[PDB]
Amino acid sequence: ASRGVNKVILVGNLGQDPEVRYMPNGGAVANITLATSESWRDKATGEMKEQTEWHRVVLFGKLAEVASEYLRKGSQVYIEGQLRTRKWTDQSGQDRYTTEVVVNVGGTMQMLGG
Amino acid sequence: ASRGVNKVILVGNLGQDPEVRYMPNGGAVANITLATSESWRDKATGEMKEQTEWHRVVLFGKLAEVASEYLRKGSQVYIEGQLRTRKWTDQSGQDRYTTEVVVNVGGTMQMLGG
Amino acid sequence: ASRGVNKVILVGNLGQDPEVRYMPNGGAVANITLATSESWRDKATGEMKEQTEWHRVVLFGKLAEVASEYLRKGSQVYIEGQLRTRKWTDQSGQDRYTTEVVVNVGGTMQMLGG
Amino acid sequence: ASRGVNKVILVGNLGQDPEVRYMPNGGAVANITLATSESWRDKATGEMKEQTEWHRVVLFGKLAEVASEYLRKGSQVYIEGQLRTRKWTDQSGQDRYTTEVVVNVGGTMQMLGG
């Protein structure tokens, strides 16, 4: 009615080991970078094309901890979270924006290995 | 699986009328802005709290045409798209990145309500 | 690989007034029925075909209480839940299965009008 | 908006081999069964409880042909479809309903892991 719905679903692999950070000012946070791709074989070129998107995902608390422990580069994972654009001034005085996929509360992540 | 899943689902209100453009031998394109919110009936100083996110949605083809003809500020809509981050040069000629929800052949847009 | 993912996302209208019930536990349950539709076009159906699915949705606790008080025949509503097939024996005393969209602690229900 | 949204996202493992069947009139249709589970060590005792849901997933055309060749018992897949409840009278004159996850034109299936 005014709240609305803000839902991201991803399945993809980590392009790097997770970077995890503890804080007795909150507890864990983990940043992960996920790739999702799209493959082609275009008529012009003759040979294969491809286009990969990198997604910045931030996990918190128990999930961040889980991430530090199990998730490594190349790992396949499922994520339900939400979009968050945050503002920051960089060192040369410029206002900048980073939109991230944040998994909290009623988001999820799951590992599609074994 | 290299490929993966890249899906965004939004339900929210347009913050402005749709901003519509044709193109080279143009197909239609339309940039819209969707608000989604999260209350927080907190302590604070006496009352609740609020954070809204604005999402940058881009529509192509018939949907772009449709949005221009029948969508206005405050319309409630459901959107299914995918995340895309594009790079672009700014007024000073440094890099700037924008992540947006692109609604494509695969996506959907529906007007909600009563 | 166990657990997996079990997610239903619905937007539609109540076919009926919500039926609310309290279980001996103490806590509410609401059974609602939600209509979604898809429209057609065809050839020796120069007419338009419409198929509507009725989904059986069950809500527990506070979300059931909310439903009773606020939701009505016609209300449009957004639901995240999971699929449950329950088994039940009928008057002749034989086995029958019903698959329902259960909205739990994992899921959500949101009123899309006011 | 009558119409609305009817979406199922599943990630799970095939409980058995794909049952595929061709039509000399409308190509392949494949039936697969997918498990999703939920574990909790709870409560009275301290012992491990499981509950698994089985989903009847129907694939059409090219996804069905793909399923035939590559999908086996235990394969892990991601599915995006819609719910369908169909009616049928069984042989002892009684009305029955089966609810199924249908993967159409707007859905997808992706094979996961490795």
From Swiss-Prot, chains A, B, C, D:
GO molecular function, one term: identical protein binding
Subunit field text: Homotetramer. Interacts, via its C-terminus, with many proteins involved in DNA metabolism such as DnaG, HolC, PriA, PriB, PriC, RecO, RecQ and SbcB. Interacts with RadD.
Statement: the UniProt record of this protein carries the keyword Methyltransferase: no
GO terms for biological process, alphabetical: DNA replication; DNA-templated DNA replication; mismatch repair; recombinational repair; SOS response
Record gene name: ssb
Activity regulation statement: The C-terminal tail exerts an inhibitory effect on ssDNA binding.
Domain SSB: 5-110
Key words of the record: DNA damage, DNA recombination, DNA repair, DNA replication, DNA-binding, Phosphoprotein
Span of the entire protein shown here: 2 to 115 of 178
Effect of residue 55 to Y: In SSB-1; destabilizes the tetramer
GO CC, one annotated term: nucleoid
Post-translational modification: Phosphorylated on tyrosine residue(s).
Protein name: Single-stranded DNA-binding protein
Known role: Plays an important role in DNA replication, recombination and repair. Binds to ssDNA and to an array of partner proteins to recruit them to their sites of action during DNA metabolism. Acts as a sliding platform that migrates on DNA via reptation. SSB or its 10 C-terminal amino acids stimulates the ATPase activity of RadD.
DNA-binding region: 54-60
Effect of substituting residue 102 to M: Increased frequency of precise excision of transposon Tn10 derivatives (mutant SSB-201)
Keyword DNA repair: yes
Domain of life: Bacteria
